[PDB]
Design a protein around this ligand. Structure first.
Ligand SMILES: [Ca+2]
Ligand SMILES: [Ca+2]
Ligand SMILES: [Ca+2]
Ligand SMILES: [Ca+2]
Ligand SMILES: [Ca+2]
Ligand SMILES: [Ca+2]
Ligand SMILES: [Ca+2]
Ligand SMILES: [Ca+2]
Lengths: 237, 237, 237, 237
């Protein structure tokens, strides 16, 4: 049903569905089998940052993930999103846990979308920046187990009172207003997203990951999308 | 019902309800009887620009209206919006015509809302910029007679095919996502809005005006709000 | 000689020159005797944030200083900077120590200056953001004892190798490009500055303070401006 | 001497030095012989817009030129600017005329430069926007025949009183503050430039072109760089 384009931060290697033998970042185009991946030296307990960029001139969706005092991981993929996604979309964050677990804490999230026309000084733009999430965040659509306000953070997956991450959990957060990614007169369309996250787990093999995604406006969590499916895909096809 | 705060560009003087004997700009706080006004040298057929600013430190809502090659009109009013508006609001543009008419064309509209916390580097923000409106503008809620797409413009009030403005019309456009104007930890909240408009009428006494407003999220056009009520207030009390 | 407008974070009370009997924030207009002050609950060793705003409509220069988990201090002063400062200025940060000392560490510094004309869509702007200072920061003019690069920070005053603040020190940092604060066709001019700082001292009565200032482009540190004069004024008149 | 990277809007085809047989846009890397070009349907007398983008992840310098109501021209080139340009540079606009002439009027110019570190929330940025140039633009370095203020525009090349473009002219405008395009801890560096221009000539074969360029900070107009050399290169090698 849903049309998904996502940049996944996959913490658990499911070699059976294509994942390499280590934590990695990937670019999914309508499938959990990333069309491109890169080795990601994930750090349990540290706060990392993910930057995602794209422009209609280059037609290259790229993402860079980093941790303070460490080398970053980068992954690019040539794709024309006008040929994949509809005109109006909704952007969001998703995460899941399965038998193995982890906290999927989002500490901040910014996003910028620009459509420049052939007309003189004619730019349309949308930009949001969340550095503090409140208990009643009305400009966010929360699905599944996602909640706001706990320490001013976004918890994508269920976390108990003592701070322990629960398993078999799945949650997503989408910005309220639909975003316009294509125009008829647009000479250049672009977008950039940034978000800091904290993945913490008492386990040695944490699972499953966090993903920034772009889907159709009426997108909802597919049934049985916990675990390796990251709350984005209905199956591993 | 609705809580309204608005900056009106009133083209028709209704001396009976408090309006001075000339076109003017005013600041309305829950009443059509502006709590403050300034003489506005309106120009039929020219494109003007309105800038609206406010910050929680100064607690002063100010607006400046200008036309190219002309002196501007300015009006300020000391008001603490935390004591007037709820935490979550929706911003928008409204216009109306009555026996006398005019076109209420919006050529562009930008808005910025910032909430800075006492935390280090903790800003929440929302910013939108419409320089080109399309026929299916999904991130706008259109009410009454407002329509998009005609020449890439927003027509707040009904306009016929030949370009002639209709009377007894009323329309509003609100940004889709609710805006957060107050926090508990906020040390400074601010917002600024800018919009260009074209008021054209074949009449010598055009009516009624355009208004940028901020209301509760479920705000709708009150019954019989055409004419002097600007599509904002149910009565002239 | 120099024309100075400054927002001072005064840590040492010099009751003899007008300072109240406690640490405070003040607004100086060509004199060290603040034309307006507010009690500031300074915290030794904590990182604080100062926000400074001004717009030509309100003609009110305001500043808010805060620390995480604490109430903020605010101070405003009605002043028309067009009547005080020249058309072109340079913005900067200054600090000093005297018999009593403190570190005057600047961890970040952003600044935005806007001039909006009566012309349609005619904004001139300058915006810089320093979150990391390098050893050779070419877009900054360093005067006195100010240095960059140490831990990616700006040290306005001299600090020894072991991290200890030296006395009788004075340093300033100015952005390289002159800023334009007034136009002939401007309908609204505004600026906002933000900077995080760390004041640390082994003493119980730290001195002297940090100040964000705006002066004429060829401004230099006046002789004997260490101590209470904050590196801004030649005398206490 | 000078290290130049430029995006040229070449109006006159000098087939002898590599230029195709028509007006075109090109990307020059230390040579007037563009390493990549695209057909440009130049329009005498119309105002066009040029957008230039680049990011250190993609390592692709792209430019899109357009006119209202027309299809745009685009050209990309894979190049790592860290391997071509020094750490600190100056950005600018240049133009020239020779036997054949044209006006090289710049109506607006914006530029954004960002350096994001691996540190949490650590962005350095510079952004300037000129929509109105004044007679004494202190934040611009003008070289050759470039002048400001005439109708609030930047005239890169000499124009007489009656509005007629002169030949054998050459002028450049550089932003005052040096820009930082590379860091040691940077995970992503990017920049985008936009400028509107008006090329008008009474001739059927106008010459020579306008170029947005990035060079070393002490860059000056090379001798005999009028005509086909665009005020950027000393020779056509
Ligand atoms: Ca996996
Ligand atoms: Ca994977
Ligand atoms: Ca009226
Ligand atoms: Ca009125
Ligand atoms: Ca003092
Ligand atoms: Ca003082
Ligand atoms: Ca040529
Ligand atoms: Ca060429």
């Amino acid at each position: 049903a849903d049309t998904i384009v996502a940049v996944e931060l996959d913490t658990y290697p499911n070699t059976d569905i294509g994942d390499p033998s280590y934590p990695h970042i990937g670019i999914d185009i309508k499938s959990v089998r990333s069309k491109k991946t890169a080795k990601w030296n994930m750090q349990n307990g540290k706060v990392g940052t993910a930057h995602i960029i794209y422009n209609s001139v280059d037609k290259r969706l790229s993402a860079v993930v980093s941790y303070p005092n460490a080398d970053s991981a980068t992954v690019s993929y040539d794709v024309d999103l006008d040929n994949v996604l509809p005109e109006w979309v909704r952007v969001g964050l998703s995460a899941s846990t399965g038998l193995y677990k982890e906290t999927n804490t989002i500490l901040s999230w910014s996003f910028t979308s620009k459509l420049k026309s052939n007309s003189t000084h004619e730019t349309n733009a949308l930009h949001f920046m969340f550095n503090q999430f409140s208990k009643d965040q009305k400009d966010l659509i929360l699905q599944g187990d996602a909640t706001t306000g706990t320490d001013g953070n976004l918890e994508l997956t269920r976390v108990s009172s003592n701070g322990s991450p629960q398993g078999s959990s799945v949650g997503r957060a989408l910005f309220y207003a639909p975003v316009h990614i294509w125009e008829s007169s647009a000479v250049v369309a672009s977008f950039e997203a940034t978000f800091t996250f904290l993945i913490k787990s008492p386990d040695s093999h944490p699972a499953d990951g966090i993903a920034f995604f772009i889907s159709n406006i009426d997108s909802s969590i597919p049934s049985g999308s916990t675990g390796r499916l990251l709350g984005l895909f209905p199956d591993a096809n």
